[PDB]
Amino acid sequence: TIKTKNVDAVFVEKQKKILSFFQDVSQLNTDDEYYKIGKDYDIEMNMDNYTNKKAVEEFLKMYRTGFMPKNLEFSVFYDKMRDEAIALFHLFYYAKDFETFYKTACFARVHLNQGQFLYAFYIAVIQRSDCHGFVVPAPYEVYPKMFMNMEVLQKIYVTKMQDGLINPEAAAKYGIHKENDYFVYKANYSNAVLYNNEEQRLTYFTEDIGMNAYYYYFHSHLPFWWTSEKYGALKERRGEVYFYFYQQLLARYYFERLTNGLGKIPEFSWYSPIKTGYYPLMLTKFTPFAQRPDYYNLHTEENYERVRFLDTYEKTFVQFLQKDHFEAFGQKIDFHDPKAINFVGNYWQDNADLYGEEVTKDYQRSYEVFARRVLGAAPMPFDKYTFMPSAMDFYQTSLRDPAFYQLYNRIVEYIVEFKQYLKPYTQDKLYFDGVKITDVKVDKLTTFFENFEFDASNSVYFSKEEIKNNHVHDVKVRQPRLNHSPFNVNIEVDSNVASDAVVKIFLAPKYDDNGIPLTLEDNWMKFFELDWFTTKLTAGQNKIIRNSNEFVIFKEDSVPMTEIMKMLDEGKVPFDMSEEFCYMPKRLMLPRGTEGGFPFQLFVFVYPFDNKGKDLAPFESFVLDNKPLGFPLDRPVVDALFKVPNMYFKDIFIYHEGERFPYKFNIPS
Amino acid sequence: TIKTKNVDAVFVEKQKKILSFFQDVSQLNTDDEYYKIGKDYDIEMNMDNYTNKKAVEEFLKMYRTGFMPKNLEFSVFYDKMRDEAIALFHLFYYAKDFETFYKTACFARVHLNQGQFLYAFYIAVIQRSDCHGFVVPAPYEVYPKMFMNMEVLQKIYVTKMQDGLINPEAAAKYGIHKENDYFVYKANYSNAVLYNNEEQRLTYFTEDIGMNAYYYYFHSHLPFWWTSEKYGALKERRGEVYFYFYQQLLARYYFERLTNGLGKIPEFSWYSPIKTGYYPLMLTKFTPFAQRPDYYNLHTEENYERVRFLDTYEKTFVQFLQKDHFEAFGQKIDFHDPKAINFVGNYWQDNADLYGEEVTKDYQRSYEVFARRVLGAAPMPFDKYTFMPSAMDFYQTSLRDPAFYQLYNRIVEYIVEFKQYLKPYTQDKLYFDGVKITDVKVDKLTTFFENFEFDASNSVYFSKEEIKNNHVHDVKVRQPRLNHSPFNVNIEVDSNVASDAVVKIFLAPKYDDNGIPLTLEDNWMKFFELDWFTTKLTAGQNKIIRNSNEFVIFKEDSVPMTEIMKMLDEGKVPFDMSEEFCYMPKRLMLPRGTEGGFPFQLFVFVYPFDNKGKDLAPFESFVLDNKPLGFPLDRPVVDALFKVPNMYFKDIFIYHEGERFPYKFNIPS
Numbered sequence A, B: 001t002i003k004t005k006n007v008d009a010v011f012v013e014k015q016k017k018i019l020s021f022f023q024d025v026s027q028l029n030t031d032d033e034y035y036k037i038g039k040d041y042d043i044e045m046n047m048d049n050y051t052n053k054k055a056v057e058e059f060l061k062m063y064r065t066g067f068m069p070k071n072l073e074f075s076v077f078y079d080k081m082r083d084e085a086i087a088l089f090h091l092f093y094y095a096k097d098f099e100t101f102y103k104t105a106c107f108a109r110v111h112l113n114q115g116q117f118l119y120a121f122y123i124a125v126i127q128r129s130d131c132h133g134f135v136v137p138a139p140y141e142v143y144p145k146m147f148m149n150m151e152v153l154q155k156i157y158v159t160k161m162q163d164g165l166i167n168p169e170a171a172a173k174y175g176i177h178k179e180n181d182y183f184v185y186k187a188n189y190s191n192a193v194l195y196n197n198e199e200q201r202l203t204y205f206t207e208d209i210g211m212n213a214y215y216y217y218f219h220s221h222l223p224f225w226w227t228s229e230k231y232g233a234l235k236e237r238r239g240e241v242y243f244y245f246y247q248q249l250l251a252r253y254y255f256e257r258l259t260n261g262l263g264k265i266p267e268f269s270w271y272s273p274i275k276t277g278y279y280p281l282m283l284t285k286f287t288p289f290a291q292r293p294d295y296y297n298l299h300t301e302e303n304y305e306r307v308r309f310l311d312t313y314e315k316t317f318v319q320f321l322q323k324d325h326f327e328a329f330g331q332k333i334d335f336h337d338p339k340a341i342n343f344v345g346n347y348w349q350d351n352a353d354l355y356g357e358e359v360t361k362d363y364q365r366s367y368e369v370f371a372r373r374v375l376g377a378a379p380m381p382f383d384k385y386t387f388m389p390s391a392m393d394f395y396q397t398s399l400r401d402p403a404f405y406q407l408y409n410r411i412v413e414y415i416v417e418f419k420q421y422l423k424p425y426t427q428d429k430l431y432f433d434g435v436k437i438t439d440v441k442v443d444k445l446t447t448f449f450e451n452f453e454f455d456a457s458n459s460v461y462f463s464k465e466e467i468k469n470n471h472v473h474d475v476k477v478r479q480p481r482l483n484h485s486p487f488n489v490n491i492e493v494d495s496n497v498a499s500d501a502v503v504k505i506f507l508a509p510k511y512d513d514n515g516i517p518l519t520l521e522d523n524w525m526k527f528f529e530l531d532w533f534t535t536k537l538t539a540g541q542n543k544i545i546r547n548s549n550e551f552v553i554f555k556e557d558s559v560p561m562t563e564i565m566k567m568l569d570e571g572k573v574p575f576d577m578s579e580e581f582c583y584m585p586k587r588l589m590l591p592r593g594t595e596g597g598f599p600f601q602l603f604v605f606v607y608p609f610d611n612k613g614k615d616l617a618p619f620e621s622f623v624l625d626n627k628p629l630g631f632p633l634d635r636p637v638v639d640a641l642f643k644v645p646n647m648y649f650k651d652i653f654i655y656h657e658g659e660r661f662p663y664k665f666n667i668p669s
C-alpha cells in the first residue's frame, strides 16, 4: 500500500552508500569504511577525477584558509558559510563519476561541519545526473531538532541519559512509551503550551513536518545562488516558477486562515512596528532561537542600514513599474511582454540568472536574505560563524514564523503589480469550440487528524558501544497530522468533434470575510491548482472520473530510512520519494474543514491539447504546455470576458471529522 | 628647535605684505599703506592686470549689486555668500603678478566683509603659483573667536574694557596673568564646565586647536567648489583623496574613543532622533551658535524637504551599488574597476570634478551641505546674509561636534560598501621576493599634556591710538594640549638581493571592546598611517632606524606671527609652516595613553620602489607611488592571503605621564 518500484544489484549498493550518510549524522563510526576512506582521502592527488579543474583548486584554497568548525550551526544566508557550501557543492557536482563522488563525501563527512555537509550533499544528490532517480530521506529524519519543540527534545535527552525509563508508568503520563525496542514520544504543537496571539490557531499547518519538509526540498531542487543552466528551457521561465511556488503556497495558507476565522495576511512597513510576535520553542546545540516580541520596531538602531537597503530594493521595483520599458542588469525589459515575469521573479530573488552567472557573489545583496534577517529580530552576528538563529535562517524552519508569510505575501503582491500590465484573456483565447462542461459532482470532502511517526534518532548521541552494535535507531516522535478521505471528481463534458483536451482543477474560496461571493476580478490569485491531466473527447457526451489519490501535484508520505533498508533487500524503492519528493504532501491538500462544512469552490477548465510545443520535463514534469503557470489564472480577469462554456464553477463544502484539536490525541490515562 | 629655512629681502618684503593682512583683522588702520592703496584702487581701470577679462567683469557686476556687508558672519555653505567668495577668489587668482594681487587684496580688506576677505585671501595664497613657498599664520591666530569658549573670550573682553587688571591677585584666581607686556589667559576644555554626555571625555581632542586648524587647511588646499585641474595628476585621484582623508581622520578619532572607553562611532537615521547633543560654548559678535539637545528629532517639519533630498542622494548610491555598472553624470562607471574610487569620492563631496567643471553651481545641491544644515539644528536662515551659525557652518569648528564624525563615518561606510567590489590583493602583489622582516622594536610610547600659548589678539578691538602705536598683539591664550615623547622604530630586514624599497608604518587597535583581537578582514579601515619612506637594501641583514620626528605625515606647531616677524628680520621662515602647512600636528600623533599602557598594534610594510611611473607632487608630496593611498590597506583584505615575509605586526603599548586631566593644569595655586 506504498507505491513501489523495482531495482537492480548496482542500484542497491549505491543507494546504501548514499543512505549511510544520513544516519548518526552528528557522530563518526571509526569502524565504518566511509571513515577509513574519508580520513586519508587526498584531494590534490585526485585532481584528474573532476570535470572542473578550477573548482578543485578553489576548494583547495578555501580548505587551507579554514572551513567553518564542527558542531557550530550552519545557515546559507551568511556569506562565508555559503561560500564554503558552494565550493563543497561544486566538488561533489564535478566529480567524474560515482566512486569519486562517494569518496569526496567520505572525506567531507569526516572533516567538515555537519550541517554544511548535509546541505551540500543533499543538493548534490538531487543535481547529479547519474544520481537522478535515487532516493533521499525526509528532511525531518535528517534534521530532527528543527522539526520539533524543546519539550519533546528534552524528554528524548532525559531518556537517553537514563538509558531508559526509571518509571514506565510515570513516563507514560508524559507521553513516553517503549514499543518493542523503540522509544515513542508524543508531541503537541506549540499552541498546547503557548497561545500568545491568534496566529497560534494555525500551528497544525505552519508547524506541520511535511509542509516544512516541502519548502526545504523546494530550495534544494534549485537553490537561489545557482544558475539553472542545467535545467535548459526552465532557465527562461525561472522567475515564473519562483512567483508560482510562492503564489500557490500563500493561497494554501490563506485557506487555512479562512477556516480558523482569520482573513487577510497583514501588510507591514520597514519603518513601523510589526504586530504579531514569534516565540520559537526550538533549541540549537549552542543557543535558543531568537524571539520577536509583539509590536517589534523593525526600524531600531541596529537596522538602519539594513532598512535603507531593503527600502531601496523595493523602491527600485516601484521605479520599474512606473517606467514600463527600461534597461536594467544588461537587459532591455518590457513590462507589456508577459515573458517579463522571468526578470520580475529573478529580481525579487536575486538569483544567479538575474546576472546571467553560474553562482551568486557576496556584493550582490539579496533582498530575501536581509529581509529575513531583520524580521528574524536576532542580535548582530558575533562573527562570520557565530549568529543567533531565528526560524527564518533555515528553510526547514521558515514556515513556522507568521512574519515569513507577510514577507512573501508582500513580494507576491509586487509581482501582481507587474501583472496588471498584461492584457486580460479574451473570449477567443479561452473558448473551446463545441465543448461544454454540463455537470460536476464531488464526493464528500472531509478532513481529519491522524497520528504519524518519524525516526528522530539523529537528534541523539550514541555511545561508542551503540555505534558499533549499530543500535542507532530507537527514537520515534508520534504526532497528529492533517489528512483527508480520498474523493472523486465527476465531470460531464459535451463536444461535437472528438479531440485531445487538457483538464485543470483549481480550489478557491467561496466568500470573503463579509460573506460576499468572490469575483474573479479581485481574487484570481487566491485559486489553488489541484490537478491537471489530459483526456480524449469523443463526439457526444463524456464522463470523466478523477480521484484525489491520482492528482499529479501531490505526493505520498515518505517512508522512514529503516523501512527503505528493508525494501532494498527486496529490490524495491518508494516511488514518490524518487521522482515526486518535492511535491506537496497529499494529506495536506485540503484546509481543515469545519464540522458544518466550510464553503469553497472547485474550478474546472477544459481546453484543447494542441500538440507538445513548449514542454517542461527537466526541472518539473509539471508544464508539458505552452501555457503560463496557473493558466488561465496567471493574470487579471474580467468576469464577463472570461466565463466560457468549457468552464465550470462548483460550490463545495469541506467537512471535518473526529477530534477537532490535535492535542486531544496526546492525552494520557 | 624650529626647522628654519633661509630667504632673500625680496621674499621678506612680499612676506611682510602678505602677513600685514592678518593683523587687527576686524579694523582699519587708516594710516597704514594698505589703506591708501585700498581706498582709491580702481578695478575697472585695471582690467588689463588680470589673466581673465570676464572674471573681472563678473566680479564688478556682482560688486555693483553689493556684497555681504561688514561684520556679519561669513560661511561658504550658503549660496550667495559662496558665489561672492568665489567671485573674489577669481579676482585674486587671475591677478597678473604679485603687485596686482597685493593692491587687489588691499581693496578687498578695506571694502569687503572680513570673513569673506580672509577666506578668499587664505585660499589665494595657497593657490597662486607665485606664492608657493610663502607662509600664512595659524588659522587659530586668524580666527581666535572660533578656537575658544565664551569664558576665555569674556575674560579677554573684560580686561580690554578695564584696560588692565583692577586686582592682580584676583585676576590670578581667574587664570589671568601679566607676563611682560602680554596678558596670558589660561583656558580649560569645555568638559571642565559641561558634561552633557560621554563624548565630553574627548574634548581635549575635538577642541584641540591644532586638529581643527588642520581641517581648515585641508579645505583650503582644495575647496570642494573648485576643480582640481591645476593639480594635474591629482585630478583622476580626487575621490580617493577625499575618502582617504576622512578614513584617516576617523581611525585617529576612533583611537581616542578606545582609550577613553567609548567604542564605535554610533550610526543614525534621517528618520529617527539622534542621541548625542552638542552645546557650543562659542560666541558670534552678532549671535550664539545653535544647540542640538540630546534626542533631537532630525525629521521635524522644517527638515521634511532637506531629508527627502538626503535620502534620495543616499538611495541613488544604493542603486549604483546594486547596478555594478551604469552611466552616471555622463560617464560609464564600473564598480570592479578600482579607479571608480575617483567617481565614488567625488559623488559624496559633490565637488566640481563630479561635473567636470571649473566651479560648482547653485543648483548642484550638495549632500554634505544639507547634512550639515540638518544636523546643525539651526532655525532657517533669516535672509541670504543672516543665518544662525552652528559648529558645522565652518571648517574651523566642525570637529567640535560629535555629529561631524557620525556624518563622515556614514559616508565613509558607504564607500567601504563599494570597496567590496574590488578584488582583494593576492600573495603575488604583496610578496617582496627574497626580503623578510625578522624583528621590529619600539621605544616607549608616552603621552603627556603640556601648556601651549597662542596670539588671540584678533578677538579684541583696539583704540585709534593703540592702532597707531601698533600695540595690538598683547593677548595670549594658554591651554594644555596633548603631546608625546620622541620614539624610535628599529626594523631588521633580511634580503639576498640589494634594491630600493618603500617602508610604510601604520598604527591600529589590537582589540575591540570585548577584548577580542582585531581580525584584518573586519578592521582594515581602522589603520592610521604614521610614515612613508624609501631606503636602499643590501644583501645580508640591515637595521633601519626611524625617529617619530622624521615621520613625513606630521608637522611641528606653527609659530606665532609675531615670531615670524622676528625671524624675517634675520631672513628666516619656519620650514613646517611653508610646505608642511596641512599635515596633522605631531603632538596629536598618538591617542592619549593610559597609565598602565594601552594596547595597540604597529604595522610595518616593506615593498619595492620599482621606478616612479606616476608620483604625487601636485597638491601633496604624498604618494610618490603608483600605489593607491593607504596601500596596502586601501581595500578589503583576506587574513590568509595577506600576511607575507615582508610584513610585521608588532604589539605596542601607549603610556601616559603626569596629569591625566587637562583641567589639572589650570588650577591656580
Ligand SMILES: *[C@@H]1O[C@H](CO)[C@@H](O[C@@H]2O[C@H](CO)[C@@H](O[C@@H]3O[C@H](CO[C@H]4O[C@H](CO[C@H]5O[C@H](CO)[C@@H](O)[C@H](O)[C@@H]5O)[C@@H](O)[C@H](O)[C@@H]4O)[C@@H](O)[C@H](O[C@H]4O[C@H](CO)[C@@H](O)[C@H](O)[C@@H]4O)[C@@H]3O)[C@H](O)[C@H]2NC(C)=O)[C@H](O)[C@H]1NC(C)=O
Pocket: A066, A067, A068, A069, A070, B516, B517
Ligand atoms: C572561551 O572563549 C574564547 C574566546 O572566544 C575561546 O578561545 C578561542 O578558542 C579557539 C579554540 O576553540 C581558538 O582557535 C584555535 O586557535 C589556534 C591558534 O590560533 C591562531 O593560530 C593559528 C595557527 O597558526 C599559528 O602558526 C604559528 C605557530 O607556529 C604562529 O606563527 C602563528 O602565530 C599562529 O598562531 C592561525 O591559523 C590562526 O589565524 C590563529 O590566529 C589554532 O591552532 C586552532 O586551529 C585549529 O582548529 C580549527 C577549528 O576550526 C581548524 O580549522 C584548524 O585546522 C586547526 O586545527 C584553533 O582554531 C581561538 O584562538 C580562541 N580565540 C581567542 C581570541 O583566543 C575558547 O575556545 C572558549 N572556551 C570555551 C571552553 O568555550
Ligand SMILES: *[C@@H]1O[C@H](CO)[C@@H](O[C@@H]2O[C@H](CO)[C@@H](O[C@@H]3O[C@H](CO)[C@@H](O)[C@H](O[C@H]4O[C@H](CO)[C@@H](O)[C@H](O)[C@@H]4O[C@@H]4O[C@H](CO)[C@@H](O)[C@H](O)[C@@H]4O)[C@@H]3O)[C@H](O)[C@H]2NC(C)=O)[C@H](O)[C@H]1NC(C)=O
Pocket: B173, B174, B175, B186, B187, B188, B192, B193, B663, B664, B666, B667, B668
Ligand atoms: C579649569 O577647570 C578646573 C576644574 O573646574 C578649575 O579648577 C578649580 O579651581 C578653583 C579655583 O578657581 C578651585 O577652587 C578653590 O579650591 C581651593 C582648595 O580647596 C580653595 O582654597 C578656594 O577657596 C577660596 O575661594 C572661595 C570662593 O572663590 C572662598 O569661598 C574661600 O573662602 C577661599 O578663599 C580662601 O579661603 C579663606 C577663607 O577662610 C580666605 O580667608 C582666604 O583669603 C582665601 O582666599 C577655591 O574653592 C577648585 O577647587 C578647582 N577644582 C578642582 C576640581 O580642582 C580651574 O580653575 C579652571 N581654570 C580656568 C583657568 O578657568
